[PDB]
Amino acid sequence: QQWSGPGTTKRFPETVLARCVKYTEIHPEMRHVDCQSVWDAFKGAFISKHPCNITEEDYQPLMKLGTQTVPCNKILLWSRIKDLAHQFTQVQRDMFTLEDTLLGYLADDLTWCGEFNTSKINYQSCPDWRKDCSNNPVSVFWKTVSRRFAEAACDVVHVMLNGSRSKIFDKNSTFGSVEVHNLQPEKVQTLEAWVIHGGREDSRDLCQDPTIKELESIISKRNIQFSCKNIYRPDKFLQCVKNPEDSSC
Amino acid sequence: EIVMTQSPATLSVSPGERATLSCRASQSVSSNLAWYQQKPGQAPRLLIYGASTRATGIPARFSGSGSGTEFTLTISSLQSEDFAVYYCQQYNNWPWTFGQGTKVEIKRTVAAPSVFIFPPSDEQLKSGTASVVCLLNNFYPREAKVQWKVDNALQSGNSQESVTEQDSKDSTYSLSSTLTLSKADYEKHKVYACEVTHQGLSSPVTKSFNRGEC
Amino acid sequence: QVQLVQSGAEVKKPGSSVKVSCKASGGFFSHYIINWVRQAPGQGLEWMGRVIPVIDDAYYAQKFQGRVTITADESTSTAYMELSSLRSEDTAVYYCARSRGYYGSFYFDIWGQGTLVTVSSASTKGPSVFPLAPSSKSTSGGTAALGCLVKDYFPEPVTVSWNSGALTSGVHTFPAVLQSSGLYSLSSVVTVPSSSLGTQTYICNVNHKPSNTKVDKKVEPKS
Ligand SMILES: *[C@@H]1O[C@H](CO)[C@@H](O)[C@H](O)[C@H]1NC(C)=O
Ligand SMILES: *[C@@H]1O[C@H](CO)[C@@H](O)[C@H](O)[C@H]1NC(C)=O
Ligand SMILES: *[C@@H]1O[C@H](CO)[C@@H](O)[C@H](O)[C@H]1NC(C)=O
């Protein structure tokens, strides 16, 4: 079997184990986690499997080991603006993206797959999401972990979006495909979108973009309030978050 | 999940008098606390939300109070239609949880039960089983000891009790105690007796029969 | 909705499935939610899950995730709760209940009438009807007690009348008790004048619709 997509990230086994040990050292609330158990549960999800035949059930053992409650009122979701979202939680250190949780941290920027009836990780090729399989070891992992993360969110949930995208809100992102449809009005009062002016100077109100009106319509039918804010100056936004009641701001 | 605990389990109140029911939350639920009334065969009915706000059409005699972990429903003058089970419910933390309820029953004067015993029918004995029924008729309060005595020996653990709802006219209870034996076990003994202790009886009342002698 | 109308009583074997319907008089109002709440006989209320009708979006208590499906059909103004792999412990009255659908208002303002679901390995069985005969030991002065023991039936309910409804005063029909066999048993008793036993005939009329059982038993005095 040869796929269209790049193979498993080189040194995947080392990276997953080292990330697990580092995260559980930095976060003493997760010190109970056995990182050997985490590796065996992760590997066990997909090794010896046809990589388009991975289910959410295949990840249940890893999900159970990685069980974690972050403050439900301090969640940042993002779509197509990951690096700025991560920089935000690096400066506003009480807030969490999915990749600030143990399971999100383990898998961030990695690709992985195996092959039917072999014991080995495939470093040669993995199914491409677009060309081979929408349901692959990576997409199934992110669907299962991100649903659980979105489900747990409460009060005011923030989502960071990229105002320089053709579609500022799109339904193929993890956010647009799974997270937005798992915010529960039992827990969530408001979704507040931050539309980042991340490219050329652009003075326009991008909260009037048709895709933002689509997002507003989706979360209105979930009985959740919608708020939208332009971030015209993202670098100044990060600075002002670190040091508020200072400078220009 | 938030555990809701109500006290007391049962409250005996005279018509026209005040009822005070308690609801406790295992952790604070702010003022996100609702009260429901439920009568037999009916769905719960919303009385109060926001700890103290009467639902539309709910009479002024119902008032709610409290915040955080400790709440009260007060019924200031109990009408005949207010005798029912009352439940609290928090809506501060998903998943939504309810107290296990307080039954508000009618206080009236002590009334002694009339006691009756029934031997097993010829019909039933042909089936290989013998049921003996003790009836306690129209008593108040509900608390009653019914002791089965077989040839003068206490026989526990072959008897089932059933109690009616408080009567609409006289506010009393009735109770059946049914002793069920194999026909074989029934025939091992002669004297079948039910002994009733109740507040309204000076001493316990025994009804008995001899097996075979009717 | 202004009223919620549920489907009739269900009797199921363990491992089977049940689907209860909830029809909304006036339809599903915008930003209101249909909740499902159950109550085991003689016990308290347990929230199971809900649906947002406009998007048919369901959300379940962890206890019921994987075993319950809650849906809403806007077209027919009907919500459903399907509970699969039924256990004896699922025996309860199931209520549909309206709430506001937004953060901070999840209390239940309009309730359906309830649907009884009985889960048992027991099979439909008509009762045996045994007389509770009046005697000296069932007579206290002027008042005599008599009755009928309605024994070993399944499922609930049974009905008892006396003299085809002509006798209603002093009648007590007790709540059924579930026996270890999985069969129900119940007594109906009446107090009458001692002086009437020689002259007045007493018949209990027992109906068990589920088994199409209709029994009339004359209750005769013993001496
Ligand atoms: C796919 O995985 C399932 C378990 O999820 C397994 O039973 C099945 O044999 C696998 N292969 C195919 C082609 O379904
Ligand atoms: C992107 O999202 C839409 C909306 O559901 C979906 O139908 C479509 O298949 C997705 N695109 C791809 C290439 O999978
Ligand atoms: C925004 O999306 C563009 C694609 O137009 C991408 O090149 C850029 O890296 C994204 N992120 C930011 C912060 O602008």
Side-chain angles (χ1 to χ4, degrees), chain A residues 129-130 134 171-172:
Chain A
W129 180 83
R130 195 171 54 87
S134 63
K171 299 175 276 65
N172 303 131

Side-chain angles (χ1 to χ4, degrees), chain A residues 89-117:
Chain A
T89 60
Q90 283 305 313
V91 299
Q92 183 79 62
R93 299 205 72 86
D94 62 339
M95 281 193 71
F96 290 79
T97 71
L98 179 56
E99 297 80 18
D100 300 309
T101 73
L102 170 60
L103 291 176
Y105 185 90
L106 290 184
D108 189 23
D109 293 318
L110 301 183
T111 319
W112 63 89
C113 68
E115 195 192 334
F116 171 66
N117 193 47

Side-chain angles (χ1 to χ4, degrees), chain B residues 167-184:
Chain B
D167 184 81
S168 57
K169 269 112 201 199
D170 71 8
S171 300
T172 65
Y173 296 96
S174 290
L175 183 148
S176 68
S177 190
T178 307
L179 179 65
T180 301
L181 308 179
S182 65
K183 183 167 163 283

Side-chain angles (χ1 to χ4, degrees), chain B residues 129, chain C residues 125-128 150-154 179 181 183-186:
Chain B
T129 59
Chain C
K125 184 179 175 299
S128 301
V150 180
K151 186 161 203 310
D152 292 340
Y153 68 86
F154 179 87
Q179 302 166 109
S181 60
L183 304 183
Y184 294 92
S185 187
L186 167 157

Side-chain angles (χ1 to χ4, degrees), chain A residues 185 188-189 218-225, chain C residues 30-33 52 54 100-103 106:
Chain A
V188 178
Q189 182 176 216
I218 290 163
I219 84 101
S220 290
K221 291 213 270 270
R222 302 198 65 75
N223 303 329
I224 293 165
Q225 293 164 330
Chain C
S30 285
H31 308 296
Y32 286 83
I33 273 179
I52 299 166
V54 70
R100 288 154 189 79
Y102 41 84
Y103 179 99
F106 283 92

Side-chain angles (χ1 to χ4, degrees), chain B residues 31 33 48-54 63-66:
Chain B
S31 53
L33 189 107
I48 293 188
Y49 65 92
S52 62
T53 306
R54 285 185 285 121
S63 77
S65 56

Side-chain angles (χ1 to χ4, degrees), chain B residues 140-162:
Chain B
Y140 189 88
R142 196 230 199 74
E143 287 67 49
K145 193 201 205 180
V146 174
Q147 292 254 94
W148 280 103
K149 280 187 153 188
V150 179
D151 290 322
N152 200 46
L154 174 62
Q155 281 280 14
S156 74
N158 293 115
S159 57
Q160 290 190 299
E161 289 194 354
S162 186

Side-chain angles (χ1 to χ4, degrees), chain A residues 80 129-131 134 167 170-173 176-177 181 214:
Chain A
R80 313 293 178 172
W129 180 83
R130 195 171 54 87
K131 297 204 295 205
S134 63
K167 295 176 171 182
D170 79 273
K171 299 175 276 65
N172 303 131
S173 66
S177 70
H181 303 301
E214 190 193 348

